């Protein structure tokens, strides 16, 4: 048996000082990098007068010397130019010249050329957007499109389609591309290696998704490996052309965490192609990416450099990007390995292309600071300091300057010096973009100084894939070429020394204003909590030691009762993994001593009340202190107990400390001497979030000043039990939270007791149920509804048209699939493709399925790990074989012999014909696929709704008609955009749906707090001017009937209801995260009077449901004559169950008859209703005797908006 922890994530190599230099200065404050790159960029006055001198000519000749002819020629609107290119582009993919040109002439300029042209024109559109406006739109408006598209033919017939297609057919073949093919480009090159320009060659290549991709990468990085050096025919690695490449295209698991793959079989891969590019001696560059790969990658670059089979070669060349703060230290140890090897490594310094991404990945992942820089004016004195470090090495590697920037060219060319000879330094550029400003360069009668072009080569579609990403190197506000482009934009602002800027700064590296810091992402609202970078070898090596540590204490969890510790039956804890691993020990609770905690519960209640809520919320800050400090023993815990992977435990405890900073603050917002507790509330919780969830209930009843009855998973009550001891350090008291840990005959107990005023669960929707049907039996003190917040699963769906990125898709849909093995309630169960793509989707994603590696989950390689119990494992495999034996098509990865020590399942791929083939909730790693074809959406979407679930749901389409139709009619709770659908951020996407999911008030947002106290308080922003219009109509009806006082109370109602709120709540860049307040549906009414049907239909008109009304009423009568508005939304109801399903419920009446109708109302088959009772006395004293929070549906929308390729918003941030 394995050691827990011993071989968590060690290291390719032990770290140097070298090394460790670089990971020191991964998150370095901006303040702290800046000011030794000042120091290191300075030159003379007299080089800074002449550098400022060359940038002006060179900008003077910029200035002095396509898209925007056709444009002003045809007249055309931004969005006309646009659907032309798409157009162009479209026609483009019709190969046969004559064919084209005849469906030009015949069929597109006479008429519909929708006719003519399953894949929509505009996918691309966001490209061609850029092109055309300069402005990044994330989405395609592709109903503007088609509507400027008609237009513009229509006015201007086949002249214009003509223009259009010769345009895009010079950009994609011979701008964004040298050639579409490998040999196109070197027979396009010879003109400007002619003029004393050489070439580098990217073949478009990355981010393999399936080894058969990673493959075919290879291939073609081969293969063009050969024709480039035949075609250099002896020229060497400074005058003749060379390679770059990717190691993201090499390998598709290309990471830190899967370190060992990539030394074993990456490294053996650019071996080979480096060997070859050795023989015909060219160069080999190995491209920049993600910063979570530049500490990984040089493990590559120290192994190739060592390997006695590449020596006597000095093609081997690496990118570093100025933009990031370990630049210095890595040239540092890049010159140092250069001196070693005694290779002369070819070192091409850029700025950096991911900018807006990495901003994004360390805000979501709620690290210390960003591993770049904030301000485009720091990775501009970075570039020039990092250039004086390797023009003092020119010995020892071969400085290669990658820039558009006049300014940052003339500072080097200057701080280079007189001396100069071929193979010294050189300058680069990319192909049809840096040539204007470099052949004021090269050559003798300019500055002398080579320049290599870095050429794209591809398809269209290969080079259409990432070219958003490229355009922003170059189109952002900041960026020199679009400044140079911008007339409002003087020389003299051109050439402005950044070093001297920078240096005359009130604080020298602040960071940027407008960029928020991840801790800082809710600003004065609450702190955001920290996650842990599991790239950061320091991070690891100190994981490794606490997660260790924590695998040797003797965890415990028992029945914790206001008095103290009780005895109880004594049971080990086991890890999932391999149950020969012991983590703990648990005592469970005794029938009595529930009872008896129920009681003591009761008796604390006015002492905890009386705590005031800035102080119970200030408990909860507390707590998260503590679970943040403690967190990696916490992982360690939830690691071996619940069976996750480190990453995943990480997200949990976040989501802890989240809970309790975000209850916190809502208090703060709300809770006053009028919101008085429910009393003791039930807790019980979930073995999949075995923290997060378990705090997140007890957090909100406690401060809300209920006492808490916490009943944690059978499984998993080691966990509960540190979170309790937390909460106990941090203030609460021993009466007011206690733990008992057990079965199902303990949570029973516990809802059953006569003094337990509310329950708050999560777990299965079948003891959902039963929990519902034992509250029906009660009352509270005052003869109302008990209640109950009950979160149950989801059948979460996922739709991808052919507007989408494969790749995208298939990780999205790994991890929303897979992750946690499938146990999380957000996890995706069914993934629907548009039949054109579904058989290419289908394929990415079954070789993606094989790169996952399953296992105990104490290994950092890990990407799956157990299901939790063997019941769970045998449910699930059950599942798939009764699938297999009906003849579909299943997908599955095989395990390793180490997993027969656990309890795992592997992830499995299901194909169906029908989402109706899918008759119950699989919980566990199995995604099912089904195909639609496009005029089948809508009713796809019905099949979603069909199921009766409406937890998680995923669109991934670039297209703004399908977003507003698919959003607009499915019916889920938690909706996300262009991105997974896992992993639910506190008070960014409250969580909670509807239906067979769940009761709400979602937890995490604003109306949660307000579930569990007795009147319930004004959430912040909760608000609405709209006014429900049949609502309004009803009002007038009452009107015209004499009903003064209902007709008052109607239109009260009618401003009272906060439908249509619709805000966007704060959070990461490039993400929108939207919170809408809807209708729930039909909601019934069991009125007794008429008064008080009255007023229940204002509530629910007022909320914008429909309503089925009790037909055992008697009340008929009083609803005569309604307004047809009013009508279309009543129905009566003699048989409860035949109309449903319902929504929610109103009832009129005494104890006793809200007693029978609340039993009644829990035998009704379906969704569990959120029930409010009034007697009519109290409808009559009480304008909010029925609340109008509990009648409307919270819908939470998060929309990835760099999904095209970059971040629109952040274009405008320098
Ligand atoms: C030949 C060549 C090879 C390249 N190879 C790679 C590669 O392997 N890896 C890679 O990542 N990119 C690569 N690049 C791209 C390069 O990193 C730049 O993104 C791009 O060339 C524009 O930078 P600049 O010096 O031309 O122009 P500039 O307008 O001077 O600089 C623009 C750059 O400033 C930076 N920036 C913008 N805003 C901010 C901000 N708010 N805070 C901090 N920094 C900011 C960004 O890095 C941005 O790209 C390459 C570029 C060329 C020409
Ligand atoms: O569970 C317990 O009893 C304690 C002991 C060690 O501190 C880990 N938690
Ligand atoms: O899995 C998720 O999406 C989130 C929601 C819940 O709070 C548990 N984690």
């Known amino acids: ?448 100084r080579p320049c290599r072009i870095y050429a794209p080569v591809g398809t269209h579609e290969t080079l259409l894939a990432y070219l958003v990403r490229r355009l922003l190197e170059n189109g952002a506000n900041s960026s020199f070429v679009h400044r140079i482009n911008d007339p409002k934009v003087s020389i003299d602002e051109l050439i402005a020394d950044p070093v001297e800027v920078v240096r005359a700064m009130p604080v020298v590296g602040a960071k940027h204003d407008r960029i928020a810091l991840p801790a800082e992402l809710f600003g004065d609202a609450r702190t955001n909590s920290a996650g842990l970078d599991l790239s950061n070898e320091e991070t690891l090596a100190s994981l490794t030691e606490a997660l260790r540590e924590s695998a040797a204490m003797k965890w415990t969890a028992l029945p914790q009762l206001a008095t103290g510790p009780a005895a109880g039956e004594t049971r080990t804890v086991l890890n999932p993994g391999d149950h020969r691993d012991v983590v703990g020990s648990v005592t469970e609770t005794s029938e009595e001593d529930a009872r008896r905690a129920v009681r003591l519960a009761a008796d604390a209640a006015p002492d905890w009340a009386a705590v005031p809520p800035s102080e119970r919320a200030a408990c909860l800050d507390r707590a998260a202190e503590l679970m943040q400090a403690r967190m990696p023993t916490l992982l360690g815990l939830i690691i071996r107990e619940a069976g996750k992977s480190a990453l995943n435990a990480i997200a949990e405890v976040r989501e802890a400390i989240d809970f309790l900073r975000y209850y916190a603050e809502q208090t703060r917002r709300t809770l006053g001497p009028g919101h008085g507790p429910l009393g003791p509330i039930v807790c019980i919780s979930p073995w999949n979030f075995p923290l997060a969830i378990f705090t997140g209930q007890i957090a909100a009843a406690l401060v809300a000043g209920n006492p808490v009855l916490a009943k944690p998973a059978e499984e998993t009550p080691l966990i509960a039990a540190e979170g309790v001891r937390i909460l106990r350090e941090a203030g609460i008291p021993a009466s007011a939270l206690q733990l008992l840990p057990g079965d199902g005959r303990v949570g029973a107990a516990l809802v059953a007791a006569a003094e337990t005023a509310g329950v708050m669960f999560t777990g299965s929707t079948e003891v959902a149920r039963l929990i519902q049907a034992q509250l029906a039996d009660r009352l509270s003190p005052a003869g109302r509804p008990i209640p109950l917040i009950a979160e149950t699963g989801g059948q979460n769906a996922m739709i991808v048209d052919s507007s989408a990125l494969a790749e995208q898709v298939v990780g999205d849909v790994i991890t929303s699939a897979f992750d946690s093995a499938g146990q999380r309630c957000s996890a995706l169960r069914v993934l629907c493709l548009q039949e054109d793509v579904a058989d290419r989707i289908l394929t990415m994603l079954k070789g993606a399925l094989h790169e996952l590696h399953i296992g105990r989950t104490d290994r950092l390689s890990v990407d799956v790990g157990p299901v939790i119990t063997s019941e769970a494992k045998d449910n699930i495999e059950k599942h798939i074989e009764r699938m297999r034996g009906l003849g579909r098509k299943v997908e599955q990865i095989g395990l390793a012999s180490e997993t027969g020590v656990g309890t795992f399942v592997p992830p499995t791929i299901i194909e169906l014909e029908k989402l109706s083939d899918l008759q119950r909730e699989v919980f566990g790693p199995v995604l099912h696929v089904i195909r639609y074809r496009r005029d089948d959406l809508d009713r796809l979407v019905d099949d979603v709704n069909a199921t009766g679930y409406g937890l998680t749901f995923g669109l991934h389409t670039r297209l703004d008609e399908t977003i507003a139709h698919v959003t607009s009619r499915i019916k889920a709770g938690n909706l996300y955009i262009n991105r997974n659908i896992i992993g639910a951020v506190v008070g960014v996407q409250p969580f909670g749906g509807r239906g067979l999911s769940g009761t709400g008030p979602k937890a995490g947002g604003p109306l949660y707090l307000g579930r569990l106290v007795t009147t319930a308080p004004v959430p912040p922003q909760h608000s609405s001017v709209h006014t429900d219009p049949v609502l309004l109509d009803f009002a007038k009806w009452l009107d015209g009937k004499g009903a003064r006082a209902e007709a008052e109370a109607a239109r009260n109602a009618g401003s009272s209801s906060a439908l249509g709120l619709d805000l966007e709540l704060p959070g990461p860049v490039g993400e929108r995260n939207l919170y809408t307040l809807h209708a729930r549906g039909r909601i019934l009414l069991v009125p007794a009077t008429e008064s008080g049907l009255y007023h229940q239909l204002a509530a629910a008109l007022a909320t914008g449901n429909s309503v089925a009304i009790d037909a055992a009423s008697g009340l008929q009568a009083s609803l005569k004559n309604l307004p047809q508005t009013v009508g279309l939304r009543v129905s009566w109801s003699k048989d409860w169950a035949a109309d449903g399903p319902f929504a929610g419920a109103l009832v009129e009446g005494d104890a006793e008859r809200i007693r029978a109708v609340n039993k009644a109302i829990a035998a009704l088959p379906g969704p569990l209703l959120l029930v409010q009772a009034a007697s009519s006395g109290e409808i009559a004293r009480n304008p909010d005797a029925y609340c109008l929070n509990w009648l409307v549906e919270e819908v939470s929308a998060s929309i990835n908006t760099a999904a095209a390729g970059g971040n629109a918003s952040l274009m405008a941030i320098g």
Not at 135 to 156: E, F, G, H, M, Y
Not at 277 to 285: E, F, M, Q, V
């Open 1 to 448: 048996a394995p050691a827990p922890f011993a071989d968590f994530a060690p290291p390719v190599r032990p770290q140097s000082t070298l090394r460790r230099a670089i990971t020191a200065a991964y998150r370095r404050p901006e303040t702290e990098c800046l000011p030794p790159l000042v120091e290191a960029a300075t030159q003379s006055k007299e080089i800074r007068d002449a550098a400022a001198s060359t940038a002006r000519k060179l900008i003077e000749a910029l200035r002095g010397k396509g898209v925007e002819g056709l444009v002003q020629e045809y007249s055309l609107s931004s969005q006309e130019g646009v659907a032309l290119m798409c157009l162009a582009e479209a026609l483009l993919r019709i190969p046969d010249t004559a064919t084209r040109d005849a469906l030009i002439r015949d069929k597109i300029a006479d008429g519909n050329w929708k006719s003519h042209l399953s894949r929509s024109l505009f996918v691309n559109a966001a490209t061609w957007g850029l092109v055309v406006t300069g402005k990044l739109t994330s989405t395609v408006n592709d109903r503007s499109l088609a509507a400027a598209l008609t237009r513009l033919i229509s006015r201007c017939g086949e002249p214009v389609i003509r223009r259009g297609v010769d345009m895009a057919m010079r950009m994609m073949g011979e701008q964004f591309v040298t050639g579409e093919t490998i040999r196109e480009a070197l027979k396009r090159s010879k003109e400007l290696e002619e003029k004393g320009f050489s070439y580098s060659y990217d073949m478009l290549g990355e981010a393999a998704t399936t080894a058969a991709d990673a493959e075919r990468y290879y291939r073609d990085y081969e293969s063009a490996i050969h024709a480039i050096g035949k075609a250099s025919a002896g020229r060497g690695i400074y005058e003749g052309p060379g390679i770059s490449i990717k190691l993201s295209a090499l390998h598709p698991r290309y990471s830190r965490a899967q370190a060992a793959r990539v030394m074993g079989e990456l490294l053996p891969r650019v071996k080979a192609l480096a060997l070859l590019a050795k023989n015909y001696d060219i160069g080999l560059n190995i491209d920049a990416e993600e910063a979570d790969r530049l500490e990984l990658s040089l493990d590559l670059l120290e192994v190739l450099c060592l390997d006695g089979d590449l020596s006597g070669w000095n093609g081997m060349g690496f990118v570093v990007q100025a933009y990031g703060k370990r630049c210095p230290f890595v040239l540092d140890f890049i010159i140092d390995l250069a001196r070693r090897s005694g290779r002369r490594i070819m070192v091409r310094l850029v700025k950096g292309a991911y900018w807006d991404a990495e901003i994004k990945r360390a805000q979501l992942d709620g690290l210390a600071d960003f591993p770049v820089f904030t301000r485009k004016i720091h990775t501009d004195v970075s570039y020039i300091a990092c250039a004086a470090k390797l023009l003092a090495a020119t010995d020892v590697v071969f400085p290669q300057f990658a820039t558009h920037n006049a300014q940052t060219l003339a500072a080097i060319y200057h701080m280079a010096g007189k001396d100069f000879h071929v193979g010294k330094y050189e300058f680069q550029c990319l192909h049809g973009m840096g040539e204007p400003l470099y052949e004021e360069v090269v050559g003798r009668g300019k500055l002398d």
